[PDB]
Amino acid sequence: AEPGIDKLFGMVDSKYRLTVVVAKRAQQLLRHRFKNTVLEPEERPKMRTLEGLYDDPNAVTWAMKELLTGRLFFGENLVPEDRLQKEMERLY
Amino acid sequence: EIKRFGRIREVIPLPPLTEIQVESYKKALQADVPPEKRENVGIQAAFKETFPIEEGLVLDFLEYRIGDPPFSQDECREKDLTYQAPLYARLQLIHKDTGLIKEDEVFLGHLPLMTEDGSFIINGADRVIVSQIHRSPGVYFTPDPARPGRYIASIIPLPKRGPWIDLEVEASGVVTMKVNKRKFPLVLLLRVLGYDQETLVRELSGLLDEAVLAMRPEEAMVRLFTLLRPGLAYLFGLLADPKRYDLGEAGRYKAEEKLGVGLSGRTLVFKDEVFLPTLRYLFALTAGVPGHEVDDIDHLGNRRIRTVGELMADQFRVGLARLARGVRERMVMGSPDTLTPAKLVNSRPLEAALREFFSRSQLSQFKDETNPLSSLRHKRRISALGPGGLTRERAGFDVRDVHRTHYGRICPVETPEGANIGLITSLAAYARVDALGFIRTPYRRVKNGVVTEEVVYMTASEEDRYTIAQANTPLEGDRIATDRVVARRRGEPVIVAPEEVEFMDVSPKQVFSLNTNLIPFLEHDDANRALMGSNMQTQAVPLIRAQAPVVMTGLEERVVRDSLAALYAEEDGEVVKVDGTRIAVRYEDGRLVHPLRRYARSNQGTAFDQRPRVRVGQRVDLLADGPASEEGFLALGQNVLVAIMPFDGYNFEDAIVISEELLKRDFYTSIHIERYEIEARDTKLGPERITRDIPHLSEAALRDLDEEGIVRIGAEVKPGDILVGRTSFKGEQEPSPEERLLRSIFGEKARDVKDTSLRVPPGEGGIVVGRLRLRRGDPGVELKPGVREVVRVFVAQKRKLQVGDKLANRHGNKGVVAKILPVEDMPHLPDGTPVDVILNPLGVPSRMNLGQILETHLGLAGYFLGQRYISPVFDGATEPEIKELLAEAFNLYFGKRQGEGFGVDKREKEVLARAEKLGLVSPGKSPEEQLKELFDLGKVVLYDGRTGEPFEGPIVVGQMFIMKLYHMVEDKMHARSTGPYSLITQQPLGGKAQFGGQRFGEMEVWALEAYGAAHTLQEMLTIKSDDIEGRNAAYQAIIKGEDVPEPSVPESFRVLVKELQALALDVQTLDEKDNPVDIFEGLA
Amino acid sequence: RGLSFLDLIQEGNQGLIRAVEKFEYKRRFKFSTYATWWIRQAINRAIADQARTIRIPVHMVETINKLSRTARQLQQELGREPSYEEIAEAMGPGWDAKRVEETLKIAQEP
DNA sequence: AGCACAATTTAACACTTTTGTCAAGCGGCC
DNA sequence: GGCCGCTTGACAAAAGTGTTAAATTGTGCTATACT
């Protein structure tokens, strides 16, 4: 399963609304700007293979953990879908 | 090692087993027989049936000639041509004034014959046909399934040879006559029979209720022709073509023993024939003494097995039919120009139409040459599907009670599979003899030296199955009898007489098929269970090893010679064999060298070999084995020590465990071959030619193993390499703009032929055995017009044994190789010999119970005692028989230990504490005996090489039989990306490099959408597959950067809108605004 | 050959439209079994025009059937199916093995 | 089974001309 | 004086227009046999 997946259902009123948030975030968490993660300290999701410790290229996992730090927000908010580019603009 | 367990082996099994084929080209094909004699049946049969073609001008048919075929054997399995021998008869048109123009045997055309092997060679594919079955002619009436009203359903001579006659009795116009497709009163036509009144009523018999239809002869002919067809009689019994129960049996010998005395062969010839005896046996049938209302009931006594002999006789006729029609047209036009019995007859209609039958007709399935037993199961396979109306798989009106079992012990009950049950079975070993040409005939012993063949319909003084005998007069007192259905206790005439007219089965092999009797202990499993195992012997993929299964019936003694898998020895002996690839000669009569098949070639990619076994001189009469055999002993799979037990889970459900021991000795290994073919087309625009200097392909990988074009023989090649680099001037894509740069930048120039080569397919890591250049300029090669240079190479490859594959012995227990742990682990016997294979239960043991374990117990027993027992089906080899054997095996086993310098082990002592309370071994003397009885019905303690401590509990061990099916893993796997494509179809299919493919079952999409998957579901039709212009988006994106795929643009939908646009229908992309009426299709 | 019975009717009866027209009422033969020909000739001129091929004039159908009758002529006088080059001698000048193969390459009904 | 005539039409190939590319010469700059 | 760059001349290779040679249709029509 997923580390604390059941805890993800409790928050979202629907199991389907959760998925959307998971990806919606991953879209602007690694692809948009890898420096948009709230989890930066020692809570930063990392892998440990033969080489060493590095951040997993997959961001879908970060969302599940990112939507557990109590931060972020979901639901009908900010009608301008073109404003997301403005906020992302400040993040280079 | 001969431990025969067979009792009273009277007459041997009906040889040569393959008699259906012999009685096919010896009963019908009266070629190798002087025209002076011979009746019909076959050529001369359908030949004479062809009435003297009218127009004097009348062509007469006489004599015939076959033999001296163009290309002999091997020359066909290499060039493709078939073994079609020329056949032609002597003709001579005749007309009023002197017109006895007889041609020189009138060279007609070709005709494929049969080989001693018992098969045919079609397009170098050497295929075989399968005789069908159908209710023989005659009146069976058939009980009305709907409402109580026994009607009539007269069976025609052949499905495709006559209007089906019938007689139903309803309300409106009771007793209505209907043949082929008619709806008229029986009286209306009964009149035409010369009988209208006074002679048909009271004399023999709602009948003449229509007196107005039984008065005038001619009128009946006019009224009838008005009821059938729109607003005919020339057939239906009249003349020989639509209705004619010729031959002399089946159709003929029926009413003579059913309806009444008297018969000409065909109904209503208009003199009635079957229209009188019918109502005579009908009116007397309804509420009468003479019952016999016995319907078809799948009674084999009525089931006709039309062999190939008559199977071709009809098709041949049908083909010869056009010839007669063609001659007529030739007689209607012209007179002096060109009219000779050789010009009016062309070798195209009676040929092409006769050849398309062996190349395309279902029955002519690709001769399964996987193994000897597979090729022999075709001539006996038999079916009901084909040109007849007993086809249609899955459904077909009402066939539920048509494929089910039947009271016919002349056919097995475990040959079918699934998709087609009852339609595909097999013939018995002691079946098909004497005049099998008509109806089947089994064997019956009279308790005295003699065997009669009174057909299957036998019912004289019941009978008894081979069970308990005592010098002709079994002192049983209760002779197990079996008459018709149930078996009334017994009979025992209580006399020194022969028997109960036929109370003797001779051998228990008469029940099951010669394929099922092979099974060792065939008497401890279910039908379905034994079914799968029986089919495993059809794809057991031969092996050079062939250790031969310990327990094997003495029936395989003929499966090696009859199948001609191996060779033979004529007359005397004195071999002085030189061996190698060409067996020497024998001092019997002359000097004839026996050349091996040289690995030959298989139709399933197996390639069988035949290693000899002799030197200096010897005779008796085996001589060199075959594919999967050993000393005249049929050895399909391979027997190896196994042990039933679970191991970490590497055998869940019904999986199988394998050790590295097998691989170290390459115990389980096979061979797979594949023929390639690269034709050099001539599109005129640019002819193709094979060269060794392919453009842009300028590299070493070529000149090294290519040269002159074709690859060198005996050169190991892997996938992704060249084999037949042909050059084509075909210029489809001219030079591209910015491409002209990268072409000039380097040291090379342009091109005008492109690479375009063969390129090894996704799987081929072996070596080439030999090539073959077959280009034009040679009149001895029938190739496609306009084609030049037809390269044909043979690539081999060793199989070894990876992971997976199906074992499945000879009982049903099938599985798959999970993991092959190298020696180290695996249960180590208390004397070495680590368990090579582990067979944990689950799957078939408890559920679909069977009897394979009875082999294990007698396996290790024959290992130590050094013997290979023989267990005949339904005879000998029982639980108590294992007791006596186990005793000797134990003392011999423990004997070594007890004398080696030890005896009884601690770890071997605690295990007894188990059985003790477990109720297994009885408490008493020292562990010596406790370990003895534990061996009789079980095995030694056994340990575990991985963990460290022995498996607490009595585990069984012994040698059984571990086979290997054709289905593997390598050639059963696939993988691809965007590489695949099939323009016009808008889906991944085809490819000159990769023939990838994958389907998304309909029952799969619904499940995918059942979840929250909406983007993943759409994706399956977003970028990939559908959207061709979208397939790039994704694949082009990821390769460049992240980014999210397109919104989706269906491709087939555009084709659907188009295909559906072929008509008025206007699939408009109505937008949510309505008035705008959005439309996406304008080339964007 | 080509076109169903129903179709053949068209090109056939149509041959009357131009046949019955050009009728030499002069000769004392009386019209009868004449158009019987103006139909078949229209048929042969049709079966060559219409077929499951592409474009077969009067210089191909006549050759195909010629190479056909020949292939069936030598066949009835040999015992085996004659090759392509072995048919050259059966024809005459210009007909070798290549062009003879080009005729059976295009089509006729395949 | 089809041949011709004519007529006319279709198809392609070759020429002389033109265009493009390469090498040589001249001029300018260092 | 030397070297490099640019421009022009010569040579070689491949097109637009002309020229002619090969194929289809129609029709003609043929043609022969039967009514």
Curated annotation (Swiss-Prot), chain A:
GO molecular function: DNA binding; DNA-directed RNA polymerase activity
A GO biological-process term: DNA-templated transcription
Catalytic EC class: transferase
Keywords: DNA-directed RNA polymerase, Nucleotidyltransferase, Transcription, Transferase
Catalytic activity: RNA(n) + a ribonucleoside 5'-triphosphate = RNA(n+1) + diphosphate
GO CC annotation: DNA-directed RNA polymerase complex
Gene3D superfamilies registered for this protein in UniProt: 3.90.940.10
InterPro entries cross-referenced by the UniProt entry: DNA-dir_RNA_pol_omega (IPR003716), Pol_omega/Rpo6/RPB6 (IPR006110), RPB6/omega-like_sf (IPR036161)
Keyword Zinc: no
Assigned EC number: 2.7.7.6
Pfam families (alphabetical): RNA_pol_Rpb6
Domain of life where this protein originates: Bacteria
Recorded family membership: Belongs to the RNA polymerase subunit omega family.
Xref: HAMAP family: RNApol_bact_RpoZ
Complex formation: The RNAP catalytic core consists of 2 alpha, 1 beta, 1 beta' and 1 omega subunit. When a sigma factor is associated with the core the holoenzyme is formed, which can initiate transcription.
Primary role: Promotes RNA polymerase assembly. Latches the N- and C-terminal regions of the beta' subunit thereby facilitating its interaction with the beta and alpha subunits.
Protein's UniProt name: DNA-directed RNA polymerase subunit omega
Organism: Thermus aquaticus
The encoding gene: rpoZ
Curated annotation (Swiss-Prot), chain B:
Superkingdom to which the source organism belongs: Bacteria
Record key words, sorted: DNA-directed RNA polymerase, Nucleotidyltransferase, Transcription, Transferase
GO cellular component: DNA-directed RNA polymerase complex
GO BP, sorted A to Z: DNA-templated transcription
EC number: 2.7.7.6
Purpose of the protein: DNA-dependent RNA polymerase catalyzes the transcription of DNA into RNA using the four ribonucleoside triphosphates as substrates.
Record family assignment: Belongs to the RNA polymerase beta chain family.
Protein name: DNA-directed RNA polymerase subunit beta
Organism: Thermus aquaticus
From Swiss-Prot, chain C:
Subunit organization: Interacts transiently with the RNA polymerase catalytic core formed by RpoA, RpoB, RpoC and RpoZ (2 alpha, 1 beta, 1 beta' and 1 omega subunit) to form the RNA polymerase holoenzyme that can initiate transcription.
Stretches the record annotates as Sigma-70 factor domain-3: 62-110
Sequence similarity: Belongs to the sigma-70 factor family. RpoD/SigA subfamily.
Locus of motif Interaction with polymerase core subunit RpoC: 7-10
Domain remarks: Contains 4 domains, connected by flexible linkers. In the active conformation, the domains are in an extended conformation, each making extensive interactions with the RNA polymerase catalytic core. In the autoinhibited state, sigma-70 factor domain-1 packs closely together with sigma-70 factor domains-2 and -4, contrary to the extended conformation that is seen when the protein is part of the RNA polymerase holoenzyme.
Region feature Sigma-70 factor domain-2, mapped onto this chain: 1-53
UniProt-recorded name of the protein: RNA polymerase sigma factor SigA
Subcellular location, record wording: Cytoplasm
Function: Sigma factors are initiation factors that promote the attachment of RNA polymerase to specific initiation sites and are then released. This sigma factor is the primary sigma factor during exponential growth.
